Design a protein around this ligand. Sequence first.
Ligand SMILES: [Yb+3]
Ligand SMILES: [Zn+2]
Length: 610
Amino acid sequence: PEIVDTCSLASPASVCRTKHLHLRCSVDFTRRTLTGTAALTVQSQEDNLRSLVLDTKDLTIEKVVINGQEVKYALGERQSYKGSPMEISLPIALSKNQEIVIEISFETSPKSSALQWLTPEQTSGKEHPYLFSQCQAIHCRAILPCQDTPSVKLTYTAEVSVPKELVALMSAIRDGETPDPEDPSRKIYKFIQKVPIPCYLIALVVGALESRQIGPRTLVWSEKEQVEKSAYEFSETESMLKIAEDLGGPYVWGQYDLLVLPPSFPYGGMENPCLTFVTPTLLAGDKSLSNVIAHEISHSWTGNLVTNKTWDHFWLNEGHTVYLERHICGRLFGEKFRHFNALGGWGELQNSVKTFGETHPFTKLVVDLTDIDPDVAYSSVPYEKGFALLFYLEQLLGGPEIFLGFLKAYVEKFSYKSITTDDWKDFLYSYFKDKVDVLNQVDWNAWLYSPGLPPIKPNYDMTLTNACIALSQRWITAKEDDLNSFNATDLKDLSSHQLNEFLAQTLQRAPLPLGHIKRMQEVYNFNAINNSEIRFRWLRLCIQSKWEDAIPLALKMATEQGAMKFTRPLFKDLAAFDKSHDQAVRTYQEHKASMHPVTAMLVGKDLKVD
Ligand SMILES: [Yb+3]
Ligand SMILES: [Zn+2]
């Protein structure tokens, strides 16, 4: 059984394995570079190993030392998004299982696709710079030399020098701080991660950070002005943790802190161990976006403990996580809610499939990322098609309680490992051997390898969805002489989630007559809502329905925060509407330079600029 990681140019795990990383670096804000030494403890998996290759992307190598001596290495020619392979000639040949530590002195590019440097004006306090990282999927190679594949798991310790007045944090347990002996104007923050992790989980943030405790094992971190709001917004964290432990077994990471990043953080959240990163667009004031926390918490099991061997199997990470996420929210709020959210997810899947096209490669559950930048292929398919499969297996195998038993054993079975879709499928058949006849009734080839919507839609309770659909239908079928019937009381019995679903149902038939949209603002005043998911969908409906007054609102939301899930569709909508097209392109060109590297590149391709 042999599978290779097409996204990595490093020696695969079958040749050698990194067991530990000891990172000693200093954050240079004046140069926008991270400088230091990455000491890798590498174990040979072969006989007579004399050299190995590591992944790198836009790194500057000062030197490589093994056994106290500088050794030969050579950087191959760059291979676009994959970066440049770095071959290192080992001084002595290694036997199988033999280990050695290679210390690489390096410097990052201010252009690193893993990093975003922010001037003081880009932060909340306006007096200090800020730095944050984002390694998933394959950007760790852009911070330090390494076997940048999730098929290798290692532990790590790190010491980071940073201006005295700032604070550093990493995906690890804080192990102290002290003044920097070699430069009084700095502080050195120490960290240790004892649980083996794929390198894409390595994370670093440096900024004027403050914290506040919100649970027995949770501190919320952010700049001063976001602390209070965040502490309230994420107050359900410990209870969600307890439910997750009940579903997946013990939380093995020690602490579970939350870091609330500046508005340009590219994702809703990132499951960095010990320190989940979240977008500040979750600060709705009513905890209505807490499913994102339940999602990240879930990853502490599905993704961080059981990890996908290569990015071709990312759905293993996301599908199981969404599945656990919905059980946490179902426990907290009722099975009817889980079905509602499960049903909404199906709607997002239809959207993704319609967007890519139903035969498009990226709509396959298991994809072939050979020569495909993971950032370009990222979408809701692995999340929702993956979730759909498990929900479908759940109803096929006997209900939530039975499938949850398989989920826990699955986590137990593959803890601290990296697996493929086949490993998952073999264990499913093994666990449910006494139901193989049932298992043999699913169209595996279609589910796992065919593009488009799944060959079968699961069954969903519709109780909380009905009112949404009914209101959506009233608006869609309404003619001009029916617009007067609409009133603020139409929303009286709807929760913020039903409101969001109401918009999603309506967005799927966009555009609607411009007069219908104006009326909607008139009676429901959606312009006044700051819930980001709701506002996002409202502005898309407005732009797609060609209401020019929405342009400034859409452009504003698109640039004042950078969560790609909101920013990319907004710029795209703005660019497809002839009246805002030039302004969309122009706004992008002017913001590009101070945008997150990955977000800039992707919006750039969506707008077809440069
Ligand atoms: Yb030998
Ligand atoms: Zn996830």
